[PDB]
Design a binder for this molecule. Structure first.
Ligand SMILES: Nc1nc2c(ncn2[C@@H]2O[C@H](COP(=O)(O)OP(=O)(O)OP(=O)(O)O)[C@@H](O)[C@H]2O)c(=O)[nH]1
Ligand SMILES: Nc1nc2c(ncn2[C@@H]2O[C@H](COP(=O)(O)OP(=O)(O)OP(=O)(O)O)[C@@H](O)[C@H]2O)c(=O)[nH]1
Ligand SMILES: Nc1nc2c(ncn2[C@@H]2O[C@H](COP(=O)(O)OP(=O)(O)OP(=O)(O)O)[C@@H](O)[C@H]2O)c(=O)[nH]1
Ligand SMILES: Nc1nc2c(ncn2[C@@H]2O[C@H](COP(=O)(O)OP(=O)(O)OP(=O)(O)O)[C@@H](O)[C@H]2O)c(=O)[nH]1
Ligand SMILES: Nc1nc2c(ncn2[C@@H]2O[C@H](COP(=O)(O)OP(=O)(O)OP(=O)(O)O)[C@@H](O)[C@H]2O)c(=O)[nH]1
Ligand SMILES: Nc1nc2c(ncn2[C@@H]2O[C@H](COP(=O)(O)OP(=O)(O)OP(=O)(O)O)[C@@H](O)[C@H]2O)c(=O)[nH]1
Ligand SMILES: Nc1nc2c(ncn2[C@@H]2O[C@H](COP(=O)(O)OP(=O)(O)OP(=O)(O)O)[C@@H](O)[C@H]2O)c(=O)[nH]1
Ligand SMILES: Nc1nc2c(ncn2[C@@H]2O[C@H](COP(=O)(O)OP(=O)(O)OP(=O)(O)O)[C@@H](O)[C@H]2O)c(=O)[nH]1
Lengths: 221, 221, 221, 221, 221, 221, 221, 221
């Protein structure tokens, strides 16, 4: 009727663990269209406060572009209606070893300064009853990435979403990323990168499994 | 009394050529403090429109951090009071060959989506009466970079600022950058990068000089 | 009233362990202004003893620049009034795995010859009650780096400062650096680099954790 | 009787062109020993002004080490008594093509902040009557490098020193370097590097020769 | 009165273990000057046996250059009068983790063909009562390197010298090198390299420590 | 009857141009066996002068090994009886473009200190009446390399040897090498390398051809 | 009826230019089967002369494998019945710029020692009336590669075959290769590689075109 | 009287373990000269069967070249009269850690198709009573490599040869190689490589030692 069974499931799971992004229920039944126009209005004000000449052919549409970007693009992960369609195939192949999807492109936004987070994620899991379609892992990652994030939370969320959908605790997520709110300003450290990992099931319990995954993490380009 | 002779000079030069960032004069004598609080207010609204729980310990101060960032950090280049102190040494060494400062760290913001532009600039010039202090070239670049930009304009601005301060038309600026408003969203092209160059004096006239510079452009890390 | 609670805490911790930089209390209430002028005075003398023509437009301001650099820049870490503002977010995400910030830019000065130490630090910790703001790790590193150091001590200082602020002994710091007082003169070894690591809590006790961190240390560029 | 014919020649050549380092004649007949003790005295004062505990076993000898380093090591290039012994072999091989010595290690000090300059020089020349001993090129570069420099002047000096000794104007010098007074502090640009070149004779006249040299410049490691 | 305490100690240690370089006591009180002239005499003979025209301006001084090189340069490690001055600082920092100096430039000569051995050493130790000055490790390595060697012995010597000076058995040395008497002639293997390691104390006893070191060995450039 | 026509031709060509290695005719009809024993005798003396214990199982045969190495191996290039067998095939393929053999392994000895020179040569020529067998270029380079050399002369000798054998002046030779008598001792420059080139015929006349060759010079590994 | 029109054309073209592989007409109407058995017979003999135990399970079938390999595989290019099927599409796209197929895998055999030649070819041409199917270029290269070759001839053959088929003289071929009969034995040069190029039409006439191609040659992996 | 004690020992050891190359005793007392002429005869026939014009100046001597190559070069390993001279030095240095010679050039021939095998071997051993001369390891590898091989057997032979000569079972050999009979033809896999390892003594027993060696295996260039 709105949210898919999966979307609902993942959402509840996150809420239960207290890992959901801080959200207040939709204050009023607003069309994304009205929300965008309102956001655009505020951007117009802010741009004017910065003394930008909004009459300039280029600058003129920026409040619109920004409103659209926030609502439809970069923060679309906040709406579970945008949760990807998950397809799982029966594990007839009897795969009992981990499947690793490495170097998943991940672009997020830091909630602290609303500045770009560019990184790559490495997800691995040991198939139980079903094998998830490869692209879905990338889609789920991008879903949670499209929200004002805190890398530490993002990793946790991805882990739970997967554990929930795959029906196994044997999931591990590692994210390596560069925060422009560290690089582009403030301390302006042009070289540092942050790495966060959340291990589930055997990936935490079994040191054998755990290290196999960790060893596999990080691959240049 | 406010702007240094240099700042004034550069500003006028840009205005004269019509290369200045679209700015409307300070509407009213507002303290950066009041501007920030106003910007913060609008951010609070926008964040609320996105349904973010502003009561969350982390999210709570984001409108403040963003306001400060815009005014004091990332868009500080809009205020010529922030123009760097230029120091020039007499060209007693009789340098008659170009001096090239390569891989200058450059972090800017696209004016179209207010999203990160990460790149590197290569500046070169042929000393006439004076030799500019090396760090000043980096400072000037970062100055113009700290504004809502359009790479094509940024390059031009840097070129003119330098030509003005050095007293020679023999200046060349090349900027190679990645736009997150292309990578992180929209067409999401993870590999493309844009390169823009503005050549002045001999760097445009003399094919010999011109190519020497172009050959020198781009160096990994 | 002067030093923040954090600054005070870290300082005391260091003193208690005997890991503080050898300092004599401020002999007399001198303005940094008077200290600088005196330092510059001594530099003038030194430069004269080297037979440098201080009347040269360029050389003329060096004593001033050096005084300023020592007091305000490169040795600012000696004054806890310059300790960074630490911000910690409650560990609601329930992160129980280490967070690693790698390739933190680190530029320090050797106390033995007052010559450049260029390196990179890798800090990792396992969140307990709170998660520290990423940039703060970078800031703290740079703080202790801005002092006449001994790499062996620098590593220890950073370790303790973090353990103190984070409220966990599970912190690990590794610094890889090139000493110009080895490279640029003396034995003039153009290739060697020194690596020092200080491990705390699980990073030292648990060989599993220990090796996970060590394995993660060092990343080119 | 003191300076070698070569040292005298080079010194004069530099003075004639006005390219010598700004030096005041030795004010008084001071032993390097007394100069050092005086320099060490001033360092003791400076360190005390920084509140350093000079009673510390390590810190205790730093003023001595710094005095020795300035006089005997890093600034030894200021004394032509330290000029290298040049050996030239008769060009019987009838070499008429350029000889290029690339990636010559070069460590110098910036005269503006007395901070490290780490770089590499590439020198090339076309043999006329004599061929210089390969290591001598390295020794001459290091000689002029061991002085408070300005890259633009350093390049020039090396060019003239060589033109003088070789008896040909066909000499070219290029230096690519990283200034720690740009990287380690101030604007703290961790990625930029400066490249300066001084071309003599055919290397400037003949575009054919000129480009062959420029093409040959820069080689990683 | 001649050899420093350290030199004497190191020498005795080696002799005791039977790891000293095969040396016969100074047959007669010969000045290095007379030794050099005699060596040069023999070289003159050898060069004449090779039919070289010693009247050639270049060739003429080779016997002198070789004699000086053998006695003063490449084989200077044979005279303990040339042992480096060691400086140790009290381990007040309470460093209990290994300090690793990697990629120490090492150039030696094979005793079998008196041909170049070019390589890099990696030394690591766990501080006990004192911390050695970083450059001293490089100096000790170069000292023993300056002798007609056998890589297997060289590694051993360095290990003992350091254990002796540091007062700890917890020292490890690894040397990776290319032998020109394998590359430049004979089997002419242009790609092979030899790696020898000597482990002491915990580096041998504790597999945990041992592997941490071994893992750390070898770094390109 | 002794020397092949080729050996004789090349030798004469070199002598005519004054590019031969400085050699005195074989003083007396000595067997290489007697020369070797004599050389070994001198090495025994030199080693004794260095206080080496020649009774050591290892050191015991070094004089012999060195004698053999000099006479049979590293300086075998001095005897034209060791000139390679040249094979040329008729240029029926009508090749009128240059053939380039790049990265030819080259190991030589500096005549100034009898120390290793390790480098790589790049030879190219435009076939006229005949095409030389590829390995022969390598063999000729190694021949001349096996002599106490001066890079500048080595390059010239190879050029002439080839022009002579190929019957064309259209030959170009470039050698890039590292001198251990610069690296391993003296100024100890661990990074510099010297490049020398000798161009003949069109490679010197035609800037088109000249630059095509130069462009092709140098290839990593 | 046997050879395709293309095959016949190419063959005749080569014969006309005198660039065909030295072949004597099929002495007698022998089945490849009888030829193979005879070749295998001779190999059996050769292996027995080498004292190999042909009764060994593995060795037993080598003569058969070699015969099949020579006739059917590595020397199949000797039979024009094996010439690839060429497909050309009408140049309706009006392509007037060169099409470059780079890094074409090329494995051939030297006619001098019947040893492996492993390399890569780069072919470029300017479309006139028709555009050739991309894979056809690879197929033609491999065809001529499958014969006992001389790199100088191979390059020529490929050039002509393509000029013939494409109906344009504007074709250029460059082959970079390693000869195991230089590497694996004889002089055993483990690093050298040979590059041969044959330019036709504008690639030879127009220096503009010529250099665009040459610049494009060679790409790692 | 013919074979050295070592050659005899190694040969017997191999035969005893059943690891010798399948050889039939020398059928008749044939001079290598007669074997070569006979081999050449067969090659003449084979070449004629391939329709090659043996009257061609180039092709004319291939039968001879191949015969010489097989007998003297590439298959010389089959004659123990070609076994290298082994020199061992008494392990007075008391080396008790493994010595590893890595990246030993290895060129062999596959016995199945008589096609090139190009690879690199890594040998390591723990000295017992004696230390083998470094080049001897290279020489032994090349010896066994110069035979029609099967990588799996080659590795074993080298292992045994070494264990025998060194008087210890603590030897490990690993070979990584590319088979042109897989690359150049058949399945034509241009990227695969095969790695085979044979471990002896502690390298097999002790997992500690075993993994230290394995970890050390493979180094690019
Ligand atoms: N743990 C964590 N911290 C983050 C993340 N994104 C940003 N931060 C940090 O959260 C903190 C925000 O701190 P504040 O002190 O409130 O803001 P600020 O002073 O403008 O930040 P800085 O100038 O960069 O130190 C900073 O230390 C940020 O770098 C993230 O994903 N995870
Ligand atoms: N042209 C040139 N400039 C140099 C060199 N070394 C340092 N400089 C610059 O010379 C100038 C010194 O400027 P000042 O403004 O007097 O000192 P400063 O303010 O401490 O310098 P910054 O904080 O780095 O901008 C700076 O721009 C230095 O980076 C050099 O070799 N060549
Ligand atoms: N020339 C130029 N274009 C830029 C720069 N920064 C952004 N742009 C582009 O300016 C345009 C904005 O176009 P709009 O069509 O108005 O906005 P948009 O549709 O949201 O943009 P896309 O979804 O990325 O195509 C886009 O094509 C941007 O990628 C810049 O520095 N220079
Ligand atoms: N352990 C340690 N030693 C350092 C550090 N920085 C410098 N050193 C060394 O501390 C020692 C100073 O030794 P001294 O002998 O007192 O001075 P010096 O003789 O001028 O030093 P060298 O000429 O470089 O050997 C040297 O070995 C320095 O390289 C550091 O961070 N840690
Ligand atoms: N273990 C060891 N061997 C070395 C070292 N330097 C040289 N060697 C070897 O010691 C041996 C000398 O052997 P000899 O047979 O006496 O001399 P050689 O025949 O001229 O040597 P090759 O022709 O290279 O095999 C050779 O195997 C050298 O490569 C070293 O540092 N360690
Ligand atoms: N041009 C040239 N010079 C060479 C070559 N090999 C060595 N040399 C140099 O020839 C010169 C010999 O100089 P001397 O001054 O006679 O000997 P030296 O003082 O021991 O040499 P250094 O200590 O290295 O400066 C040195 O500059 C050597 O580095 C070569 O191939 N070509
Ligand atoms: N020009 C050319 N020469 C080749 C080619 N393949 C092999 N050769 C060379 O042709 C020559 C054969 O020379 P020969 O002297 O007849 O045989 P060889 O003595 O066994 O050869 P080497 O021992 O390698 O010098 C050698 O110089 C080979 O390296 C090729 O494609 N082109
Ligand atoms: N294990 C092993 N196999 C090898 C080696 N060299 C070659 N081979 C393989 O031994 C087998 C020979 O197989 P055959 O089927 O008798 O000959 P073939 O059909 O011509 O071989 P392909 O066409 O390459 O599959 C092939 O699979 C070869 O690739 C080696 O060193 N070790």
């Amino acid at each position: 009727p709105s949210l898919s069974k999966e979307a609902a499931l993942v959402h509840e799971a996150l809420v239960a663990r207290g890992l959901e992004t801080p959200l207040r229920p939709p204050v009023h039944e607003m069309d994304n269209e009205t929300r965008k126009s309102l956001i655009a209005g505020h951007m117009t004000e802010i741009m004017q406060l910065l003394n930008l000449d909004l009459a300039d052919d280029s600058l003129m549409e920026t409040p619109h572009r920004i409103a659209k970007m926030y609502v439809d693009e970069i923060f679309s992960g906040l709406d579970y209606a945008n949760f990807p369609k998950i397809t799982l195939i029966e594990n007839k192949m009897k795969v009992d070893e981990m499947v690793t999807v490495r170097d998943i492109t991940l672009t997020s936004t830091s909630e602290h300064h609303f500045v770009t987070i560019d990184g790559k994620a490495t997800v691995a899991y040991i198939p139980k009853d079903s094998v998830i379609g490869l692209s879905k892992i990338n889609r789920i990652v991008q879903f949670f990435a499209q929200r004002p994030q805190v890398q530490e939370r993002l990793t946790q969320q991805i882990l739970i979403a997967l554990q929930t959908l795959l029906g196994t605790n044997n999931v591990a997520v590692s994210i390596d990323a560069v925060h422009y709110c560290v690089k582009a300003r403030g301390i302006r450290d042009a070289t540092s990168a942050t790495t966060t990992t959340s291990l589930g099931g055997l990936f935490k319990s079994s040191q054998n499994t755990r290290h196999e995954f960790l060893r596999a993490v990080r691959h240049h380009n």
